[PDB]
């Protein structure tokens, strides 16, 4: 168990982190034509409006909470961040899960979507739904330690992982098992990221907000 | 690194523009190579479409990755004069989608055979080492023959091999020829102009073995009998570029933009030159979109509008204000001044035959063929036999021309037109009128069945002491039209508003077209013609030519053009466009296609009579002859079933027969030898005695039906074949969807020339072999399917009526999988046949019947009336009162050697056509060098015919259209007849020799030839009849001029000596089936029209996904909104259309442009795609020809009479079909009959 | 003032025979792949009708093109930058596959493999190219309404029937139809380029062709809504959008587009147009949409003006391009004769593919009528195609330019007829519409005779300028996969070099 604990929380994090980065770079340089969102909306618009929005607005809330949550004193003691994460993040998570579930019911049972889908699209979406379900499931476990004791552990781990500080696994001494599953499945998603449709995330079109409307390319 | 490039974000931004609205970027664009490499290709090869469309468009075939990927039109056609637009790019949507077929899911890759047939074949070969005898063991067993014939069209095809199928085919051919006769083997292939050598392949094999070659021009109803009637020419029309020389055009029943797509620009562009255009279509057709005026007469009533228009023209441009141009034109170029004899009736006279030199005492000084020379009055009241009549063509030389001269003194005369002002008395002549008959669907105008008119006449002293009254065709014509000339004729018009025998008011009632419109266009058309000296044109198509009375529709249009002197003038005349019948290098191709280089004659047959007979469509006839007779004819002189008239036609040598005799024609000689008589005499003696009979008399006896049929470049069973259900039943012997009862079942009257039996003979064909590149409807019902090469995988040539260029078909890549070109397929069959026949057929003697031929001296058969020898009205004289009885030697073991070499007859006898012949030795010497020669064997020393290219080179070197050397010799030959030099028409191109490889580089314009009446010149466009009018070469008609008056007995008694309005006929095919099998939904009778579709050429391309995707995804039928709403039919609902002949299923296209009363199922969408089961037959839904049936017309069976003599595709019965009516209804149950459990049910 | 050039296209609807050859050739070459089998870069629609995709001209439903705000600034009807971004997770206006049609195929092999002993003739039923499942029935296609196929009340929903009392056209005698072949407009103010979040769409500087960079496109599928002509098609398989590429691989060497060279009716004209890129926004944002047509004409430059020529050179336009621009049929039809009009100028994109309105048979009248100013030939007032309809299609509802074009065409006809039939010179119709004898003669040369060299005057895109054609000539096409194409920086992870480049630098300078 100590062996697994070290593999999964000291080693695996760097394997998935290295594969995530080099896998993204390499697919960007040698697979531009494969770098797309892979929309399926046109093949079946039904329910996509509600489903995709729910899922995306939701998962993006979580992602913001997780980001500023674990990677960032007086006005923001861990206990206050925990509460925000539980209510704000829990709400986003419920929106995400519903959307995710709807998108999956569509991908599996909408004849046109199912017929033209790829294995990865089913796998990745499935793992996200499960990850989001696990996530919400940690809420009742964090609810047993409203002082932010668990959160302090998870955040200790995350921060020592990203600053390449060994022993990160220690920070997790005794956290509720559920959190372990969530961390592992969540990291796995990073490992599968460069080989899935998830690469669209790298392309969030922020430059658009400030770009001139007409583009003209000179001879080249 | 594309990743690192991003960081150059800032460095890649250049200048902004439009005040910050735009940004110029200097970023990478290499990705653009992606589309560039798709366009890039290996090479381009020139080829064209071997399909029947008249397009004849040269394409660029792109090969990429060693495969055919797409095509774009060639644009390098030799450019036309500077004042004319050029032809490029031509092409159409169908042609653009052909590449699809090469590797598509419907490509035929291997020879296929019906499983049941294969199993019996292999088991028979295990008991019979000889294949002929293995076949016999199968075919002679009733149960074996039936197990595979009823398997036809019911799956079970298995992959075979060329070795297997070739032996079975050869075995079957040998056996059939040996036991029944060569003419029991037949082949059907259409329009050779689209792929000359491909057609020639099967035709050559068949000709050498004595098989019958079936016609197509008449069968498809593209033949306008009116042309052979008026000009004695099958069909000759001006080229499309000539439309640009016209200043007034009427598109009458011709959907130019949809059916003549590559030439449409000439029509849309000439408009910019000031030319006015008028569209005449019942529906708002595509053609209407391009005209200045849209006239919509009720479908089938067109002749009425023509007559009315002709009326005004005569009144205003011939009578009231005589046009100097029109007057001289009809005087010198029509039979108007010719004299017609009046026949005594009871209180009135009837127009009889034309006066002949022979009727006058002096015979007018005519000793040669005086009974074949027409007569007229010169302006000094003298009688005369003018040059040009068909009498001066044969038995003499120098006077067969249109120089206005006296055929006796050789001096110039001036023919007078009307006797008015020189009459001895006014006689009353009865003119037939049918404008009051017809069904309830067309308006009628009651008058009298016989209209008496006052005609000026002159009494003459005949050469037999009798006295008779005569008058001009001209007077008879103005009377027939209803022109009041001062005799106070009660049946003549007092004004255009006078409802009478041919007025604008009269026509308005029949057609529904405002009289004022009829009058305005009539004037304008004639005014323009007068101003420009004939530059008025009428483009007509199947919209008019596919009706039962097509001749009336046509003569109506023709008369208008003649009255305005438009025929023979560039920019004017009759522009008939239908199928691609113009194979220009004719006399170069004929000897190749029918083996005239080895044996003469071949066995040609007119397909309409052939299928009417063998598919037993006659046993269901509803139309009788008596109901078509003139009211002025002795109805008792014309009793019998319509087929009876055909049989009589056959024995009188007017039409061909197939099979010919009731006995194997290879055994006749061996019997003439034991009788001490030569073959010909023994057969005539036997015919009289009745020991030998014409096969037509007993088609169901078991030995007079065809047994082996080859189908290639055709989709007969499916598409083409009228009476689809009848073919399935009597020719194939499979399930059929016929709904009605036959004569025997309705207790009708049996024919008087043909045996009758209550249970018709079924499944007559023993073996059906189809060659194709796609599994068509015909293949689906065949026994053996042979994978043929697509147009992009073989060499061949193509020509057309639309332009003067001859270009090729070329193999871009070798035929895929196991496919072979038609030429190689038939050569291999010929090769296996030559082996297999050893011991069964040797050097045989064949007795062949050949009907009397037009353009041969024999055309002068029966000059004054009709005598049937079997009725003892005359002796049996082959070549005059009966067909010629020819002797032909056949060397069956040498078939292959003959097939692959140009025979000796081209050297021994020469070459020729259309009444002329010439020496062609020089050409054969040239050919020995281009094709190399046989090193040994039966054909040692003769030029070779191994490849399709050698065959093509044969055609080019022999034809006058492609070899200036031959062109001059040909014009020289003609010059002997006319006494006028015509060589000047080709001297300036005598050095011209079109080569196959040169046309692969660039299409070449052909050479002016006597085979045609238009010229290939740099200053004047090709215009039909141009030579007749400008070179004074007479039309091959009784009078040598354009014949307005048809004086043949049958023509007169069937009321068609002069044109007259004839309402659509009643096929009585709806009232006996309507309601009989209700499904709950309403039913209604509608006129069923089948114009040619936009998503295919006939059925070709119909299965092409691109066409199916741009169309409606499969078989569909157009209905007017009103008819659809009445029947509860919504757009795209499944409907069923049916009648006595069968049923079809399809989806509806509801549209406003379709006038109530008519429905349109664009021709051919066939039987293989998206068709559910029929609720009427419980079988797979049928096709558009499941509801049609062949019904012949006697006037089309006339032979042995000048312009009305036979010729392959020149004359014969036609397969008209626009008169048909059907029952339409919304379908209820939609069962697919495929065990997929995926059926539907339509509501209400 | 920044001069740029582009090869524009003019289609003479008067000569269009509605044959679709143009659509087939494009399909065979560019869109036969799975993913775009339903896409028809070039498609021809019969009007009245709703087109393909269904009712694409309805901008209130589809949200295509530009709108001019109250402050005068331009904005995509789709919404501004943030509005558009807010719709990215699910484009609310995106057309579905059913708005085009469900691509289908047939089971031909059943005709081949049907087992012996079948109880009915075998047949080939339809199957979906999207699902592979049996299709019970084909209910739609890209050219479903061809030749007035459908009930009038259905076809008449045509957005162009707005403001027209259309009842009279449901009567058989007043029936009318015309053909509208269309492709991408390659606009001067493209909405697609403005509505793409990743900036993957651009207008090439040298020839004005607008492309979707297949490398850079991210599949945000917003551009489809942006294009008011609905000429951008989503490739459902690749996940990226594709569209008419104006056959640049051919145009680049001076060849006409495939749909231009293959046009059977000889109605397409290709010619250069010089334009002021600096005037684009100004012209596209004019207040009255009825002025957009003329405002665009004002953005076009006169190729024979030495002021324009001199500026063109200064701005980089190749000499051969300037020469082509001086013999441009497109310039003659759009600027001189005023025969060609833009397609839906009200979308404010400044379309570069224009049209000559069609003539039509005369309307149904009480009697055969009588001669008019043009003799037996028709007067513009007798034409059966309602001019208001043509105006809604080409001139934002203004009938003036449509009538001027139609009338001038008829004028040419009247004049030419006097000449070829009567043999006289009658300029009465010309003077009436302001055409000189020479202009009419030149109109006739181009429209009627239409020699190949006159319909297509395409200059080279000069791929040698600002690039290195020599090494390209030597190594292009060897697609072994060097992994260095597509980027300007030489470093690459696979430690390789370009096959079509010279990496051994000259040391002699
Ligand atoms: C490797 C990446 C991830 C890590 C390290 C991670 C870590 C965590 C932690 C430590 C918590 C509990 C917070 C506390 O201690 O109070 C949590 C909760 C949660 N996570 Fe994640 N997570 C990851 C990815 C994801 C993803 C991809 C999803 C969406 C499918 C997700 C959805 C949730 C939800 C719904 C909750 C519960 C409510 C909340 O805290 O907002 N997580 N995650
Ligand atoms: S099918 Fe006929 S008209 Fe069409 S491109 Fe081929 S040859 Fe030309
Ligand atoms: S027509 Fe072409 S350039 Fe214009 S907006 Fe649409 S896709 Fe863009
Ligand atoms: S090819 Fe030309 S004439 Fe035919 S539909 Fe296309 S644009 Fe019209
Ligand atoms: S919005 Fe842009 S990302 Fe692609 S799908 Fe359209 S070009
Ligand atoms: Mo035909």
Contact yes or no for A220 and C236 at CB 8 A: no
- Among the listed residues B513, B264, B298, B1153, the one whose alpha carbon sits nearest the alpha carbon of residue C176: B1153
- Compute, in angstroms, the gap from residue A84 CA to the centroid of ligand 1: 13
Q: Is B10 touching A (CB cutoff 8 A)?
A: no
In words, the CATH class of domain B107-218+585-789+818-897 is: alpha beta
Contact yes or no for C15 and B269 at CB 8 A: yes
Residues written for chain A: 220
**B-chain residues near C416 (CB < 8 A):** 272-274
In a domain, A218, yes or no: no
In a domain, A216, yes or no: no
- Compute, in angstroms, the gap from residue A36 CA to the centroid of ligand 5: 9
- For residue B752, the tally of other CB atoms under 10 A from its CB is 12
- Compute, in angstroms, the gap from residue B259 CA to the centroid of ligand 2: 10
CA distance B106 to chain C (A): 5
Pairing of strands B1134-1139, B1142-1151: antiparallel
Q: Beta partners for B277?
A: B249
Q: At what angle do helices A90-109 and A48-70 cross, to 10 degrees?
A: 140
Distances (CA, A) of C506 to C498, C502, C509: 17, 10, 6
Contact between C398 and C391 under an 8 Å Cβ cutoff? The reply is: yes
Q: Is C258 touching B (CB cutoff 8 A)?
A: yes
Contact between C182 and C231 under an 8 Å Cβ cutoff? The reply is: yes
- Among the listed residues B1054, B48, B97, the one whose alpha carbon sits nearest the alpha carbon of residue B637: B1054
Contact between B1085 and B1223 under an 8 Å Cβ cutoff? The reply is: yes
Q: At how many Å resolution was this determined?
A: 2.3
Q: Does residue B51 line the site of ligand 2, with CB under 6 A?
A: yes
Closest ligand 1 atom number to CA of residue A100: 30
Contact between A197 and A22 under an 8 Å Cβ cutoff? The reply is: no
Please give the helix or strand (H or E) that residue B461 lies within, else none.
strand B450-461
The strand order across the sheet containing B1004-1005 reads B796-798, B805-809, B1004-1005
- CA separation for the pair B1046, B1028 (Å, rounded): 20
CA B214, chain centre distance (Å) = 12
Contact between B407 and B375 under an 8 Å Cβ cutoff? The reply is: no
- Among the listed residues B1019, B895, B766, the one whose alpha carbon sits nearest the alpha carbon of residue B142: B766
Pocket test for ligand 2, best of B46, B48, B259 (most atoms within 8 A of CB): B48
CA neighbours closer than 13 Å in the CB half-sphere of residue B762: 15
Q: Is B21 touching A (CB cutoff 8 A)?
A: yes
Q: Is A26 touching C (CB cutoff 8 A)?
A: yes
CA neighbours closer than 13 Å in the CB half-sphere of residue C250: 20
The three-point CA angle C393-C395-C401 to 5° equals 125
- Compute, in angstroms, the gap from residue C263 CA to the centroid of ligand 4: 5
In a domain, A217, yes or no: no
Q: What is the largest CA-CA distance in chain A?
A: 65
- CA separation for the pair B456, B471 (Å, rounded): 7
Phi, psi (rounded to 5 degrees) for A14: -90, -25
Contact between B874 and B917 under an 8 Å Cβ cutoff? The reply is: no
Place of tokens 């215009």: B1023
CATH number of the domain enclosing A168: 1.20.950.20
Q: Does residue C267 line the site of ligand 4, with CB under 6 A?
A: yes
Distances (CA, A) of B369 to A169, B356, B387, B858: 123, 10, 13, 12
Q: What is the DSSP string of B359-395?
A: GBTTGGG--SSGGG-B-EEBTTS-EE-BTTSTTTTSS
Q: Which of residues 24-53 of A touch B (CB under 8 A)?
A: 25, 28-29, 32
- Among the listed residues B234, B225, B478, the one whose alpha carbon sits nearest the alpha carbon of residue B336: B478
Contact between C233 and C241 under an 8 Å Cβ cutoff? The reply is: yes
Phi, psi (rounded to 5 degrees) for B36: -60, -45
Q: How many domains does chain A have?
A: 1
The strand order across the sheet containing B157-159 reads B157-159, B112-114, B784-787, B767-772, B708-712, B185-188, B212-214, B603-605
- Percentages helix, strand, coil for chain B (3-state, rounded to 5) are 30, 20, 50
Phi-psi bin for B1177: left (phi > 0), alpha (psi -120 to 50), beta? alpha
Helix (H, G, I), strand (E, B) or coil at B13: strand
Q: What is the DSSP string of B98-166?
A: GGGGGTSTTB--S-EEEHHHHHHHHHHHTT-SSHHHHHHHHHT-HHHHHHHHSSTTS--EEE--HHHHH
- CA separation for the pair C189, C227 (Å, rounded): 11
Q: Is B979 touching C (CB cutoff 8 A)?
A: no
What burial class does residue B494 get, using C-beta atoms within 10 Å of its C-beta: 0-12 exposed, 13-18 middle, 19+ buried?
A: exposed
The closest CB to that of C448, out of B85, B1113, B1147, belongs to B85
Q: Is B1073 touching C (CB cutoff 8 A)?
A: no
Distances (CA, A) of B764 to B100, B614, B700, B761: 36, 8, 9, 7
- CA separation for the pair C429, B1113 (Å, rounded): 48
Helix (H, G, I), strand (E, B) or coil at C445: helix
Domains and CATH numbers, chain C: 1-16+245-358+436-467 (3.30.70.20), 17-244 (no CATH), 359-435 (1.10.3650.10)
The closest CB to that of C96, out of A38, A42, A207, belongs to A42
DSSP for residue B1033: P
Rg, Å, chain A Cα set: 19
The residue whose CA has the least distance to atom 2 of ligand 2 is: B55
Helix (H, G, I), strand (E, B) or coil at C508: coil
- Which of the residues C120, C153, C187, C471 would you substitute to probe the B interface, choosing the one with the greatest number of B C-beta atoms within 10 Å? C120
Q: Is B87 touching C (CB cutoff 8 A)?
A: no
Closest chain B residue to C203, measured at CA: B24
**B-chain residues near C112 (CB < 8 A):** 106, 112, 157, 775
- CA separation for the pair B1171, B1169 (Å, rounded): 6
Phi-psi bin for B739: left (phi > 0), alpha (psi -120 to 50), beta? alpha
DSSP for residue B407: T
B465-481 burial, b if ≥16 CB within 10 A, otherwise e? eeebbbbbbbbbbbbbb
Which are the contacts of B47, defined by CB distance < 8 A and separation ≥ 6? Answer: B58, B59, B61, B791, B792, B808, B809, B810, B812
Q: Does residue A187 line the site of ligand 1, with CB under 6 A?
A: yes
The closest CB to that of A214, out of B2, B14, B23, belongs to B23
Rg, Å, chain B Cα set: 31
Q: Is C203 touching A (CB cutoff 8 A)?
A: yes
> Cis before residue A131, ω within 30 degrees of 0?
no
- CA separation for the pair B510, B1061 (Å, rounded): 10
Distances (CA, A) of B522 to B278, B310, B323, B333, C374: 11, 7, 15, 22, 19
Contact between C207 and A188 under an 8 Å Cβ cutoff? The reply is: no
- Given a contact as 3+ CB pairs under 8 Å, which chains touch C? A, B
Q: Beta partners for B1092?
A: B1163
Place of tokens 């096409």: C477
In words, the CATH class of domain B1047-1237 is: mainly beta
Q: What is the DSSP string of B506-566?
A: HHHHHH---HHHHHHHHHHHHHHHHHHTS-EEEEE-HHHHTSTTHHHHHHHHHHHHHHTT-
- CA separation for the pair C312, C303 (Å, rounded): 9
- Percentages helix, strand, coil for chain A (3-state, rounded to 5) are 75, 0, 20
Contact yes or no for C179 and B1112 at CB 8 A: no
Pocket test for ligand 2, best of B91, B581, B792 (most atoms within 8 A of CB): B91
Domain boundaries, chain B: 1-106+790-817+898-1022, 107-218+585-789+818-897, 220-584+1023-1046, 1047-1237
Pairing of strands B1221-1226, B1083-1089: antiparallel
Alpha helices in B1054-1142 (DSSP H): 1105-1110, 1121-1127
- Compute, in angstroms, the gap from residue C267 CA to the centroid of ligand 4: 7
- Among the listed residues B960, B860, B852, B851, the one whose alpha carbon sits nearest the alpha carbon of residue B913: B960
CA A32, chain centre distance (Å) = 23
- CA separation for the pair B474, B462 (Å, rounded): 22
Sign (positive or negative) of CA dihedral B1103, B1105, B1106, B1108: positive
Which are the contacts of C36, defined by CB distance < 8 A and separation ≥ 6? Answer: C233, C235, C237, C242
Phi, psi (rounded to 5 degrees) for C244: -50, 130
CA distance A167 to chain C (A): 33
Distances (CA, A) of B541 to A2, B955, C456: 92, 30, 34
The closest CB to that of A115, out of C85, C131, C216, belongs to C131
Distances (CA, A) of B713 to B11, B771, C156: 65, 7, 43
B362-397 burial, b if ≥16 CB within 10 A, otherwise e? ebbebeebbebbbbbbbeeeebbbbbbbbbbbbeee
- CA separation for the pair C348, C285 (Å, rounded): 7
- Among the listed residues B1167, B1144, B1093, the one whose alpha carbon sits nearest the alpha carbon of residue B51: B1093
Strand boundaries in B998-1128, DSSP class E: 1004-1005, 1083-1089, 1116-1120
**After which residues does a break in chain C occur, C–N more than 2.5 Å?**
none
**Domain enclosing residue A38, as ranges:** 2-211
Four-CA torsion B870, B871, B874, B880, nearest 10 degrees:
-40
- Compute, in angstroms, the gap from residue C217 CA to the centroid of ligand 5: 5
Give B1068-1072 contacts, CB < 8 A, sequence gap 24+.
B1068/B622, B1068/B623, B1068/B1140, B1069/B622, B1069/B740, B1069/B1139, B1069/B1140, B1069/B1141, B1069/B1187, B1069/B1189, B1069/B1220, B1069/B1221, B1069/B1222, B1070/B1139, B1070/B1140, B1070/B1221, B1070/B1222, B1070/B1223, B1072/B740, B1072/B1140
The three-point CA angle B980-B983-B989 to 5° equals 160
Contact yes or no for A205 and C465 at CB 8 A: no
Distances (CA, A) of C427 to B484, B707, C419: 43, 71, 10
- Which of the residues A26, A205, A220 would you substitute to probe the B interface, choosing the one with the greatest number of B C-beta atoms within 10 Å? A220
Phi, psi (rounded to 5 degrees) for B38: -80, -45
Q: At what angle do helices B822-836 and B948-958 cross, to 10 degrees?
A: 100
Q: Beta partners for C43?
A: C182
């Amino acid at each position: 168990m100590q062996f697994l604990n070290m593999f999964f929380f000291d080693i695996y994090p760097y394997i998935a982190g290295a594969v995530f980065l080099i896998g993204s770079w390499l697919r960007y340089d040698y697979g531009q034509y494969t770098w797309r969102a892979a929309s399926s909306q046109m093949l079946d618009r039904k329910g996509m409006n509600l489903a995709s929005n729910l899922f995306h607005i939701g998962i993006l809330g979580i992602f913001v909470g997780h980001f500023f949550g674990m990677l960032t004193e007086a006005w923001l003691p861990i206990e206050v961040k925990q509460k925000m994460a539980m209510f704000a993040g829990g709400a986003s998570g419920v929106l995400c899960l519903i959307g995710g579930v709807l998108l999956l019911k569509r991908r599996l049972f909408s004849p046109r979507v199912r017929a033209t889908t790829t294995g990865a699209d089913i796998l990745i979406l499935s793992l996200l739904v499960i990850q989001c379900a696990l996530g919400l499931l940690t809420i009742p476990f964090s609810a047993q330690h409203m002082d932010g004791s668990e959160m302090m552990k998870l955040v200790g781990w995350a921060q020592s992982v990203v600053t390449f500080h060994g022993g990160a696994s220690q920070h997790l001494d005794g956290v509720a098992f559920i959190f372990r599953l969530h961390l592992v499945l969540g990291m796995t998603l990073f490992l599968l990221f460069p080989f899935s449709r998830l690469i669209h995330i790298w392309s969030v079109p922020v430059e658009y907000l400030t770009r001139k409307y007409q583009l003209v390319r000179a001879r080249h | 690194s594309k990743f690192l490039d991003r960081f150059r974000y800032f460095k890649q931004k250049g200048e902004t523009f439009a005040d910050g609205h735009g940004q110029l970027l200097n970023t990478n664009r290499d990705w653009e190579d992606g589309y560039r490499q798709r366009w890039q290709h290996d090479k381009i090869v020139r080829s064209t479409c071997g399909v029947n469309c008249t397009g004849s468009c040269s394409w660029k075939i792109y090969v990429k990755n060693g495969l055919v990927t797409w095509e774009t039109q060639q644009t390098d056609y030799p450019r036309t004069r500077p004042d004319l637009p050029n032809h490029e790019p031509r092409g159409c949507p169908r042609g653009a989608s052909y590449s699809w077929y090469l590797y598509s899911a419907n490509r035929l890759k291997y020879p296929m055979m019906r499983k049941r047939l294969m199993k019996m074949w292999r088991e028979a070969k295990a008991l019979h080492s000889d294949p002929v005898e293995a076949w016999a063991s199968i075919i002679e067993d009733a149960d074996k023959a039936k197990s595979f014939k009823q398997a036809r069209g019911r799956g079970g095809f298995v992959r075979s091999s060329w070795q297997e199928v070739n032996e079975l085919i050869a075995a079957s051919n040998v056996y059939t020829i040996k036991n029944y006769g060569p003419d029991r083997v037949a082949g059907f292939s259409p329009i050779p102009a689209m792929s000359m050598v491909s057609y020639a392949s099967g035709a050559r094999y068949l000709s050498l073995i004595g098989g019958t070659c079936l016609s197509f021009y008449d069968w498809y109803c593209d033949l306008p009998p009116a042309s052979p009637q008026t000009w004695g020419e099958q069909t000759d029309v001006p080229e499309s570029a000539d439309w640009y020389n016209s200043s007034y055009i009427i598109a009458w029943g011709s959907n130019v933009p949809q059916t003549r797509t590559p030439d449409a620009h000439f029509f849309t562009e000439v408009r910019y030159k000031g030319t006015k255009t008028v569209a005449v279509t019942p529906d708002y057709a595509e053609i209407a979109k391009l005209c200045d005026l849209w006239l919509a007469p009720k479908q089938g009533t067109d002749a009425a509008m023509a007559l009315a228009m002709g009326h005004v023209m005569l009144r205003e441009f011939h009578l009231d204000n005589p046009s100097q141009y029109f007057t001289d034109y009809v005087r010198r170029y029509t039979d108007m001044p010719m004299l017609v004899m009046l026949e005594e009736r009871d209180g009135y006279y009837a127009a009889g035959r034309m006066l002949r030199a022979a009727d006058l005492v002096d015979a007018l000084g005519q000793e040669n063929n005086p009974e074949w020379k027409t007569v007229a009055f010169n302006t000094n009241g003298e009688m005369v036999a003018p040059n040009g009549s068909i009498g001066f063509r044969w038995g003499e030389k120098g006077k067969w021309n249109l120089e206005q001269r006296d055929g006796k003194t050789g001096e110039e005369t001036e023919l007078q037109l009307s006797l008015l002002g020189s009459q001895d008395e006014i006689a009353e002549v009865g003119f037939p009128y049918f404008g009051g008959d017809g069904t309830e669907h067309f308006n009628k105008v009651e008058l009298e069945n016989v209209l008496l008119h006052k005609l000026p006449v002159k009494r003459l002293q005949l050469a037999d002491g009798s006295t008779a009254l005569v008058t001009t065709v001209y007077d008879l014509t103005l009377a027939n039209y209803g022109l009041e000339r001062g005799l106070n004729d009660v049946n003549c018009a007092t004004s255009y508003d006078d409802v009478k025998a041919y007025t604008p008011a009269w026509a308005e009632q029949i057609t529904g077209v405002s009289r004022s419109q009829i009058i305005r266009i009539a004037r304008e058309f004639a005014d323009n013609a007068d101003k420009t000296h004939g530059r008025s044109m009428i483009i007509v198509g199947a919209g008019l030519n596919h009706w039962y009375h097509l001749d009336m529709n046509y003569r109506g249009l023709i008369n208008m053009l003649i009255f305005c002197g438009c025929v023979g003038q560039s920019g004017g005349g009759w522009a008939h466009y239908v199928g691609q019948e113009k194979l220009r290098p004719q006399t170069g191709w004929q000897p190749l296609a029918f083996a005239l280089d080895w044996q003469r004659p071949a066995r040609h047959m007119n397909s309409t009579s052939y299928f009417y007979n063998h598919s037993s469509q006659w046993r269901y006839e509803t139309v009788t002859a008596e109901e078509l007779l003139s009211p002025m004819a002795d109805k008792s002189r014309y009793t019998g079933h319509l087929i009876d008239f055909n049989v009589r036609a056959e024995r009188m040598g007017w039409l061909p027969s197939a099979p010919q005799l009731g006995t194997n024609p290879l055994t006749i000689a061996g019997e003439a030898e034991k009788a001490g008589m030569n073959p010909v005499d023994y057969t005539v003696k036997s015919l009289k005695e009745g020991s030998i009979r014409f096969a037509a008399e007993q088609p169901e006896n078991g030995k007079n039906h065809p047994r082996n049929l080859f189908i290639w470049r055709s989709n007969l069973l499916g598409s083409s074949g009228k009476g689809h259900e009848f073919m399935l039943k009597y020719l194939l012997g499979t399930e059929h969807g016929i709904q009605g009862k036959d004569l025997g079942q309705q207790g009708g009257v049996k024919p008087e020339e043909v045996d009758w039996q209550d249970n018709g003979l079924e499944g007559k064909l023993d073996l059906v072999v189809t060659l194709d590149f796609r599994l068509s409807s015909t293949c689906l019902y065949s026994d053996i399917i042979l994978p043929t090469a697509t147009w992009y995988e073989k060499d061949d040539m193509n020509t057309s009526d639309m332009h003067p260029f001859i270009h090729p078909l070329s193999a871009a890549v070798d035929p895929a999988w196991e496919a072979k070109s038609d030429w190689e397929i038939y050569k291999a069959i010929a090769k296996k046949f030559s082996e297999v026949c050893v011991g069964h057929l040797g050097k045989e003697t064949d007795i062949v019947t050949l009907p009397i031929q037009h353009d041969s001296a024999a055309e002068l058969a029966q000059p004054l009336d009709v005598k049937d020898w079997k009725k003892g009205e005359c002796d049996l004289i082959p070549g005059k009162t009966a067909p010629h009885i020819m002797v032909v030697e056949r060397d069956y073991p040498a078939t292959y050697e003959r097939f692959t070499s140009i025979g000796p007859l081209m050297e021994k006898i020469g070459n020729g056509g259309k009444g002329i012949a010439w020496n062609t030795q020089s050409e054969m010497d040239l050919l020995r060098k281009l094709n190399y020669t046989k090193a040994e064997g039966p054909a040692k020393g003769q030029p070779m015919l191994n490849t399709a290219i050698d065959a093509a080179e044969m055609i080019l070197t022999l034809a006058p259209e492609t070899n200036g050397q031959v062109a001059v010799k040909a014009w020289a030959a003609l010059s002997e007849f006319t006494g006028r030099d015509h060589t000047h028409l080709a001297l300036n191109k005598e050095d011209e020799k079109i080569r196959f490889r040169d046309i692969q580089a660039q299409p070449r314009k052909i050479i002016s030839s006597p085979t045609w009446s238009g010229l290939e010149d740099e200053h004047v466009s090709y215009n039909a009849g141009y030579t007749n009018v400008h070179e004074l070469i007479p039309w091959r008609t009784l009078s040598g001029r354009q014949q307005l008056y048809q004086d043949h007995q049958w023509m007169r008694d069937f009321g068609e000596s002069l044109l007259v309005y004839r309402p659509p006929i009643d096929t009585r095919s709806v009232k006996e089936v309507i309601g009989q099998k209700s499904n709950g939904n309403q039913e209604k009778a509608l006129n069923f029209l089948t114009p040619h579709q936009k998503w295919g050429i006939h059925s070709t391309y119909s299965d092409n996904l691109l066409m199916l995707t741009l169309g409606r995804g499969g078989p569909v039928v157009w209905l007017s909104e009103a008819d659809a709403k009445d029947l509860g039919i919504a757009d795209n609902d499944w409907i069923e259309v049916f009648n006595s002949n069968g049923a079809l299923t399809a989806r509806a296209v509801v549209s406003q442009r379709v006038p109530a009363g008519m429905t349109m199922m664009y021709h051919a969408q066939e039987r293989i795609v998206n068709l559910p089961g029929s609720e009427i037959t419980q079988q797979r839904g049928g096709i558009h020809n499941s509801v049609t049936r062949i019904t012949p017309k006697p006037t089309h069976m006339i032979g042995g009479y000048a312009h009305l003599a036979y010729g392959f595709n020149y004359y014969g019965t036609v397969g008209s079909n626009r008169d048909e009516f059907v029952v339409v209804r919304k379908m209820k149950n939609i069962d697919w009959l495929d065990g997929e459990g995926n059926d539907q049910v339509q509501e209400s | 003032m920044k001069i740029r050039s582009q090869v524009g296209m003019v289609l003479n609807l008067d000569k269009c025979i509605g044959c679709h050859t143009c659509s087939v050739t494009c399909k065979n070459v560019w869109t036969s792949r799975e993913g775009v089998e339903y896409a028809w870069f070039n498609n021809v629609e019969t009007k009245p009708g709703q087109g393909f995709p269904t009712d694409w001209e309805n901008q209130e439903k589809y949200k295509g093109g530009w709108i001019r705000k109250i402050n005068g600034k331009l904005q995509p009807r789709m919404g501004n930058r943030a509005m558009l971004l807010g719709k990215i997770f699910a484009n609310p206006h995106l057309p579905g596959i059913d708005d085009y049609y469900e691509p289908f195929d047939f089971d031909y092999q059943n005709l081949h493999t049907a087992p012996e002993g079948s109880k009915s003739q075998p047949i080939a039923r339809p199957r979906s190219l999207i699902t592979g499942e049996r299709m019970a029935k084909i209910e739609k296609g890209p050219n479903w309404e061809d030749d007035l196929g459908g009930e009038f009340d259905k076809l008449a929903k045509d957005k162009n029937f707005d403001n027209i009392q259309k009842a009279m056209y449901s009567q058989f005698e007043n029936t009318f139809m015309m053909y509208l072949p269309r492709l991408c407009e390659h606009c001067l103010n493209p909405a697609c380029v403005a509505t793409c979040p990743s900036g993957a769409i651009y207008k090439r500087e040298e020839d004005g062709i607008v492309l979707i960079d297949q490398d850079k496109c991210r599949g945000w599928r917003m551009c489809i809504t942006g294009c008011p002509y609905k000429k951008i098609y989503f490739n459902w398989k690749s996940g990226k959008s594709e569209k008419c590429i104006f056959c640049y691989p051919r145009i680049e060497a001076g060849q006409p587009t495939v749909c231009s060279e293959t046009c059977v009716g000889r109605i397409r004209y290709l010619g250069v147009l010089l334009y002021d890129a600096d005037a684009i926004e100004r012209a596209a944002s004019t207040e009255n949409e009825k002025d957009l047509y003329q405002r665009q004409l004002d953005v076009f430059l006169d190729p024979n003006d030495p002021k324009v020529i001199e500026q063109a050179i200064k701005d980089g336009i190749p000499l051969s391009v300037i020469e082509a621009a001086q013999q441009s049929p497109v310039y003659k039809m759009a600027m001189e004769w005023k025969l060609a009009l833009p397609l839906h100028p009200e979308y404010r994109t400044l379309p570069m593919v224009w049209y000559v309105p069609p003539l039509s048979p005369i309307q149904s009248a009480a009697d055969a009528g009588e001669l008019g100013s043009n003799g037996i030939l028709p007067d513009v007032e007798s034409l059966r195609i309602p001019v208001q309809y043509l105006a809604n299609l080409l001139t934002a509802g203004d009938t003036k330019p449509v009538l001027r074009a139609l009338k001038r065409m008829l004028a040419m006809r009247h004049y030419k007829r006097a000449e070829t039939v009567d043999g006289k010179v009658d300029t009465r119709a010309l003077e009436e519409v302001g055409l000189t004898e020479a202009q009419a003669q030149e109109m006739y040369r181009y429209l009627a005779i239409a020699n190949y060299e006159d319909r297509f005057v395409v200059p080279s895109s000069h791929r040698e300028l600002a690039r290195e054609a020599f090494p390209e000539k030597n190594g292009c096409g060897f697609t072994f996969g060097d992994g260095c194409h597509g980027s300007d920086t030489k470093f690459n992870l696979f430690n390789s070099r370009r096959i079509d480049a010279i990496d051994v630098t000259s040391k002699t300078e």
